[PDB]
Design a binder for this molecule. Structure first.
Ligand code: CHL
Ligand code: CHL
Ligand code: CLA
Ligand code: CLA
Ligand code: CLA
Ligand code: CLA
Ligand code: CLA
Ligand SMILES: CC(/C=C/C=C(C)/C=C/[C@@]12O[C@]1(C)C[C@@H](O)CC2(C)C)=C\C=C\C=C(C)\C=C\C=C(C)\C=C\[C@@]12O[C@]1(C)C[C@@H](O)CC2(C)C
Ligand SMILES: CC(/C=C/C=C(C)/C=C/[C@@]12O[C@]1(C)C[C@@H](O)CC2(C)C)=C\C=C\C=C(C)\C=C\C=C(C)\C=C\[C@@]12O[C@]1(C)C[C@@H](O)CC2(C)C
Ligand SMILES: CC1=C[C@H](O)CC(C)(C)[C@H]1/C=C/C(C)=C/C=C/C(C)=C/C=C/C=C(C)/C=C/C=C(C)/C=C/C1=C(C)C[C@H](O)CC1(C)C
Ligand SMILES: CC1=C[C@H](O)CC(C)(C)[C@H]1/C=C/C(C)=C/C=C/C(C)=C/C=C/C=C(C)/C=C/C=C(C)/C=C/C1=C(C)C[C@H](O)CC1(C)C
Lengths: 201, 184, 193, 209
């Protein structure tokens, strides 16, 4: 019934007999998807400057590696920002508090977020019975997957780009600790001398 | 007839009183006890303001009305004859509220009595000329009244900002309208 | 019609409205009291923005440029926001009650014979329409009001993020590409005040 | 109806009948109805003292930040005491008598609806009635008689009053945790933040607090 089912569970997690807590079918399909959606943001978001900068669109300052942005101060922090990294992290917490807890309240109560006023948006945030796939004019402006078949296939398309982008992030990290360079400088140096620029070296 | 045309007046204001233009954002006139009191303070307040703003102008048609405080019978000598005369008079008006008719009769010369009358509009002695007619006058009274009340706070903030009185502050405004506002 | 192929419009956006296009993906018009106010505001934006974009370039052609404003137009200094604050207060609040109460404020407070005709709310007519444009294509014109409007609003939002990034009046911003297109873009002006 | 934590339904013991009732007692404190009747007065008075206090700082502080005369709220007790003739111990004791009297009478209205109403005082009978736990009214407590005006007009103010109450209580404690973390006045804390808001935050000096 879940999309991305190619039958891969050595560890009997999704087995619904005597389930409890966070080892719940409804729950994990959710995680994987939200995981997928974030992972694809990170994958395309980590590289883009290193690429676009090298491409010569982005100035000399901005064109940094992913771990040199000021997330991990000791690996490098940026300067040229609207503010310091901590006056940001607060603007983050308030926002992600709102926009993650709301999303939790659709999971917890389907109908909720539809009733209690929220600057006109309460009309929007009704849900879709299914949690992972809310839609409505906010989160599906183009009304794509107009049929049940075309939707199920788009749900197939989503999870696979995701799972790939999650491994890609497991990539960029495990890669950055051993190399100490960004996964686009690793790629171009690997085009130049495939056997010299390698794990084994 | 309304302070803000197209408004509905509040429920308690029904156009019975003189200068009821449907105005009580904070339902001040909500309870009949309080609205009976507030009626008086709004007469008397204007009556004192009309009397005073009439004064300020005509006394300066000179010197600063504000520093008139500095003027033949000592200070405490004069503050007494005010206190007793004002205490006398104000108590007697305040009885007419305490009970609507309680006072009307000349305690000395009890031959002379003030005829039955609406509160705060006493007449008899106090309406000799019996001038212009019926309520309309009471509506000039409260209008001309409020304008006088406002003008006074004007006259005060006009003093406490320019230094000059009213007619000079105007002559100053005429000289440089674009310049002599609060916004400069 | 509509705003995107493959989307269904919402049940409040019937098409009754001059420039309906099933465009509200944040729910905001789903309240019917909000949809009456917002559309006064959207009218109100448009109808400035169109004086607003006109004003820019008709005085850009007869002289960044707009952003700068202080002593220059035969005024050493004259201090003024009095005239605006009182009249624009006077005026707007008369609109205020004509939303607050559809009909109340269609008549002259002083010379009570005079009277703006029963419009639609925000389409006052009478003296606000003295070239006898009452009748004809009422709603076709209203589709022109909003669509020239909505351009002008994004035209002005445009002129400004120009007038900052570059510091150029948006004719002189145009005619800085007429010369050097590939080397004079957003991409070279993300950049700067 | 609107709630503190949208979606999560409000707990039974909250009706939507009391002013500022947003289904918020996550710790089951005010469950037994008497023990909540008690807290709806604590909250009101707390908020009324907090409002007077916040209005009390917010005016002195601009008065000090408008002309170099008035003292900062922190070091403005000694400035009142030293400069003027008066002593601390007596004020603190005078206060306790008047506040003692004022409270000890409210004290015996919580447990007894219309207790002090009996005229057993200065013949003042009708002024010290019950009415509604938290709003005593009459010629003294509600002179103008908004209490005895209209049903809706008064209901809306209960709403206004508790909210302002809760905002002033927050406001007040900021004043108290802002002098602490930065050692300055609340229109020096406000001027410094308007001139350079991105940098002058807590992030600078004011820690987790
Ligand atoms: C009841 C109304 C009443 C009002 C509104 C005023 C108002 C005023 N008096 Mg007056 N007085 C009044 C009654 C009386 N005054 C005085 C005797 C004085 C004196 C002796 C002085 C004033 C002064 C003042 C001014 C205080 C300065 C100020 O507030 O600046 C903000 C102010 C314009 C002072 C003055 O002249 O200020 C320049 C002053 O020294 N008043 C007498 C007679 C005893 C009064 C009797 O009712
Ligand atoms: C809500 C109650 C309340 C609070 C929070 C304060 C808080 C304060 N008072 Mg105040 N007072 C309060 C009620 C009262 N005070 C006073 C009378 C005084 C005096 C006499 C003095 C203070 C002083 C102080 C300060 C002592 C310095 C300190 O503790 O540094 C740690 C402090 C900011 C002292 C001060 O200003 O020192 C700087 C001071 O001189 N207070 C009275 C009696 C009328 C109060 C009655 O409720
Ligand atoms: C933290 C991320 C995450 C989460 C929560 C899940 C959760 C799930 N995956 Mg997995 N999956 C992930 C990452 C994740 N996946 C990644 C990165 C890959 C790529 C290697 C896959 C590849 C994969 C396959 C091939 C299959 C699943 C399947 C499943 C489901 C059953 C498997 C199980 O043990 O439970 C379950 C909803 C099964 C499914 O879709 O059902 C299934 O057959 N996943
Ligand atoms: C949610 C994921 C995510 C996160 C946390 C970040 C975080 C960041 N990105 Mg972004 N980025 C993301 C997704 C994300 N990016 C994606 C999906 C893309 C593709 C469009 C990009 C493309 C991108 C560019 C092109 C740039 C950033 C930049 C930045 C940094 C400064 C933010 C800013 O511009 O203000 C910051 C570390 C800027 C930087 O300084 O590097 C910058 O110029 N990002
Ligand atoms: C209750 C109102 C009121 C009050 C309190 C005052 C008070 C005063 N007026 Mg008066 N004045 C008033 C109304 C008032 N005026 C009115 C209605 C007029 C006529 C419109 C005047 C016209 C007037 C003149 C012409 C003069 C005063 C003067 C004075 C002062 C001298 C005392 C006195 O007359 O003996 C005194 C402060 C005299 C003064 O200031 O010296 C003075 O010459 N007043
Ligand atoms: C501050 C400006 C503003 C405001 C308040 C509104 C308000 C409105 N617009 Mg929008 N609109 C605006 C700017 C604005 N618009 C601009 C600049 C554009 C161009 C991108 C558009 C393009 C646009 C379209 C195409 C449509 C609306 C529509 C609407 C209405 C329904 C959606 C809603 O409530 O939002 C509402 C009256 C919809 C309607 O029903 O009319 C509609 O179809 N607007
Ligand atoms: C002295 C502090 C004080 C006290 C005694 C109370 C007492 C009360 N508050 Mg609270 N409240 C306070 C401060 C206080 N409040 C402050 C500072 C805020 C603002 C953050 C709030 C915001 C608040 C909300 C949002 C709600 C309460 C509510 C309540 C009632 C719930 C039961 C309970 O807490 O016990 C109770 C009467 C609930 C109620 O129904 O009333 C409710 O919905 N309060
Ligand atoms: C009025 C206006 C500008 C007015 C400017 C004026 C008077 C200019 C005056 C002057 O120039 C002169 C003449 C001469 C100069 O010397 C001085 C200045 C002072 C410079 C701009 C509006 C500008 C208005 C803009 C840009 C508004 C855009 C709104 C949008 C896009 C909203 C869209 C949506 O709301 C919907 C419809 C539905 C939802 O579901 C989804 C979202 C997306 C939220
Ligand atoms: C914030 C506050 C109290 C907060 C309490 C909260 C949040 C309670 C919340 C909860 O219980 C609920 C509802 C439900 C539970 O399930 C959970 C919790 C979360 C437990 C009170 C502040 C209250 C603040 C007050 C009363 C301050 C007033 C100050 C006074 C009176 C006088 C002082 C001054 O005079 C000086 C000394 C010098 C002058 O210069 C200046 C002034 C300031 C004027
Ligand atoms: C399923 C199963 C089944 C069976 O039964 C068993 C087994 C097999 C065991 C299991 C498991 C599997 C696995 C391995 C999984 C994995 C996952 C992952 C990795 C995820 C990620 C995931 C991931 C993710 C989300 C991520 C994200 C990220 C991001 C956003 C980023 C961001 C950023 C950026 C841009 C930039 C800056 O500067 C930095 C940062 C800030 C950093
Ligand atoms: C919802 C909605 C709604 C409406 O209706 C419509 C619309 C709007 C359309 C929609 C939206 C959408 C979106 C947002 C999307 C997104 C996407 C993405 C971003 C993806 C990525 C995605 C991504 C991905 C996969 C990624 C991947 C990656 C990879 C493999 C990597 C690789 C690598 C590695 C490791 C290492 C080395 O050394 C380098 C490299 C070689 C580089």
């Amino acid at each position: 019934s879940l999309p991305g089912d190619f039958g891969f569970d050595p560890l009997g997690l999704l087995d619904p007999v005597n389930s409890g807590g966070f080892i719940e079918p409804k729950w994990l399909q959710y995680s994987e998807v939200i995981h997928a959606r974030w992972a694809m943001l990170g994958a395309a978001g980590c590289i883009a400057p290193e690429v676009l900068g090298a491409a010569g669109l982005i100035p000399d300052a901005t064109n940094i590696k992913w771990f040199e942005s000021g997330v991990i101060p000791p690996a490098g922090s940026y300067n040229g920002y609207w503010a310091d990294p901590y006056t940001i992290f607060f603007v983050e917490i308030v926002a992600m508090q709102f926009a993650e807890l709301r999303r939790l309240q659709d999971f917890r109560y389907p109908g909720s977020m539809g009733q209690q006023y929220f600057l006109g948006l309460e009309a929007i945030f009704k849900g879709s019975g299914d949690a992972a796939y809310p839609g409505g004019p906010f989160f599906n402006l183009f009304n794509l997957g107009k049929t049940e078949a075309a939707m199920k296939e788009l749900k197939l398309k989503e999870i696979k780009n995701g799972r790939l982008a999650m491994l890609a992030m497991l990539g960029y990290g495990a890669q950055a600790v051993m190399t100490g360079k960004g996964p686009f400088q690793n790629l171009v140096e690997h085009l130049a001398d495939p056997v010299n620029n390698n794990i084994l070296t | 007839p309304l302070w803000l045309p197209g408004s509905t007046p509040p429920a308690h204001l029904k156009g019975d009183l003189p200068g009821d233009f449907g105005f009580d954002p904070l339902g001040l006139g909500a309870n009949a006890e309080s609205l009976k009191w507030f009626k008086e303070s709004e007469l008397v307040h204007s009556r004192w303001a009309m009397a005073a703003v009439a004064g300020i102008l005509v006394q300066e048609i000179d010197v600063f009305w504000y520093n008139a405080g500095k003027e033949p019978l000592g200070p405490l000598g004069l503050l007494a004859v005010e206190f007793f005369l004002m205490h006398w008079v104000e108590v007697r008006r305040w009885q007419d509220l305490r009970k609507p008719g309680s006072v009307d009769q000349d305690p000395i010369f009890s031959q002379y009595k003030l005829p039955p009358h609406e509160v705060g509009y006493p007449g008899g002695v106090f309406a000799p000329f019996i001038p212009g007619d019926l309520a309309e006058l009471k509506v000039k009274e409260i209008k001309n009244g409020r304008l006088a009340m406002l003008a006074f706070v004007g006259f005060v903030m006009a003093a406490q900002v320019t230094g000059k009185g009213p007619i000079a502050a105007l002559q100053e405004h005429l000289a440089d309208p674009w310049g002599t506002t609060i916004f400069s | 019609k509509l705003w995107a192929p493959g989307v269904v419009a919402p049940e409040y956006l019937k098409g009754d409205l001059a420039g309906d296009y099933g465009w509200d993906p944040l729910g905001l018009g789903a309240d019917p009291t909000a949809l009456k106010w917002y559309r006064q505001s959207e009218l109100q934006h448009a109808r400035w923005a169109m004086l607003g974009v006109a004003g820019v370039l008709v005085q850009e052609i007869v002289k960044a440029g707009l952003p700068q404003n202080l002593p220059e137009p035969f005024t050493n200094i004259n201090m003024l926001l009095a005239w605006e604050f009182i009249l624009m207060h006077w005026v707007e609040v008369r609109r205020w009650q004509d939303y607050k109460n559809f009909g109340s404020v269609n008549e002259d407070p002083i010379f009570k014979g005079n009277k703006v005709p029963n419009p639609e709310m925000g389409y006052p007519g009478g003296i606000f329409d003295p070239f006898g444009f009452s009748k004809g294509n009422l709603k076709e014109l209203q589709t022109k009001e909003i669509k020239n409007g909505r351009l002008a609003m994004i035209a002005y939002m445009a002129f400004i993020l120009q007038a900052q990034a570059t510091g150029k009046g948006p004719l002189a911003a145009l005619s800085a590409h007429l010369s050097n297109p590939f080397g004079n873009n957003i991409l070279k002006n993300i950049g700067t005040c | 109806r609107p709630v503190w934590f949208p979606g999560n339904p409000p707990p039974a013991h909250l009706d939507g009948s009391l002013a500022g009732d947003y289904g918020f007692d996550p710790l089951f404190l005010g469950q037994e109805p008497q023990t909540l009747k008690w807290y709806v007065q604590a909250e009101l008075v707390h908020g009324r003292f907090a409002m007077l206090g916040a209005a009390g700082i917010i005016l002195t502080s601009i008065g000090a930040k408008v002309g170099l005369g008035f003292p900062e709220w922190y070091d403005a007790g000694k400035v009142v005491v030293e400069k003027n003739n008066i002593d601390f111990p007596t004020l603190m004791v005078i206060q306790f008598y008047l506040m003692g009297w004022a409270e000890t009478k409210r004290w015996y209205d919580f447990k007894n609806p219309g207790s002090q109403a009996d005229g057993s005082f200065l013949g003042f009978t009708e002024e010290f009635k019950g009415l509604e736990n938290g709003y005593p009214g009459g010629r003294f407590f509600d002179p103008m008689g908004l209490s005895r005006g209209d049903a809706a007009k008064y209901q809306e103010y209960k709403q206004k009053e508790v909210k302002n109450g809760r905002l002033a209580m927050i406001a007040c404690l900021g004043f108290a945790a802002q002098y602490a973390a930065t050692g300055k006045g609340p229109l020096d804390n406000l001027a410094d933040h308007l001139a350079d808001p991105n940098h002058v935050n807590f992030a600078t000096n004011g820690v987790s607090n």
